[PDB]
Amino acid sequence: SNALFSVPVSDQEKAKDFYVETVGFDLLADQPGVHGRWLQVAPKGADTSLVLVDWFPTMPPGSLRGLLLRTDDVDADCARLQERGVAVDGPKNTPWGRQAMFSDPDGNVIGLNQ
């Protein structure tokens, strides 16, 4: 089911480089919006998208925690991320799936769960 979450970033261009080019989420839109540059990405195969925003000051840049996105191969994702210079915690098993966390340039933590 469709869901959209707003990730607080300090520099939208650097965030685009990270999420689209480094992590490999697909770019869905990069166009003017009501509050600023509307920059929207989503994992391939997913119906959950992230908007990389800078206009919600109650959410300081890099403050996001506690987000998990489904993946079909968390070990593959982690190997690719570490190869590309990204900090990764995990993978680790839980009763609810096999999960890992990584941080974006501002410190937002993105979780992946298989």
Residues flagged as binding site: 31, 47, 96, 99
Binding residues with its own copies: total (CB under 8 A): 28
Which residue, 72 or 82, has its beta carbon nearer to its own copies? 72
The partner in contact with residue 69, picked from its own copies, Ca ion, none with C-beta cut-offs of 5 to 8 angstroms by kind, is its own copies
Residue 58 sits in the site that holds its own copies (CB under 8 A): yes
For Ca ion, the binding residues in 45-104 under the rule CB under 5 A are 47-48
Scored b (16 or more CB within 10 A) or e, 28-55 reads eeeeeeeeebbbbbbbeeeeebbbbbbe
